[PDB]
Amino acid sequence: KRVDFCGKGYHLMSFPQSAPHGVVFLHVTYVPAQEKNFTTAPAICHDGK
Amino acid sequence: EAEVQIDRLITGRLQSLQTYVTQQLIRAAEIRASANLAATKMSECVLGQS
Numbered sequence: 884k885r886v887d888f889c890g891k892g893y894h895l896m897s898f899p900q901s902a903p904h905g906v907v908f909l910h911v912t913y914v915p916a917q918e919k920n921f922t923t924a925p926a927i928c929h930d931g932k
Numbered sequence: 933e934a935e936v937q938i939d940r941l942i943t944g945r946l947q948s949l950q951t952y953v954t955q956q957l958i959r960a961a962e963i964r965a966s967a968n969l970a971a972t973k974m975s976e977c978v979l980g981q982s
Contacts, residue, residue, distance in 0.1 A: 886980040 889897060890910035900907040976982060 885976050887975045 888894070889908070890912035892912040892914045895911045895913055897911065898909045900909065
């Protein structure tokens with residue numbers, strides 16, 4: 884849940900691999916795209932509530 | 933005898949230099965640890981919520 888600890892973006896899962904004198908992690912990460920604009924509002928009134 | 937005197941002076945200055953270098957190495961390692969902690973705090977507390 885801590886951001887940017889494993890990968891750049893939301894983290895999903897990882898796989899370790901060996902090396903001659905170390906370890907190599909493959910991180911699977913989720914990244915959004917294709918945005919839009921819309922118009923927002925914080926709350927909606929109805930019947931005074 | 934000039935060579936004797938120069939030998940003594942070189943020896944002493946050399947130990948002084950080596951001591952200074954070793955102290956610098958220790959301090960640099962400590963600063964590196966502190967800056968790594970600072971980078972972690974910056975990347976975790978600012979870009980998101982803790």
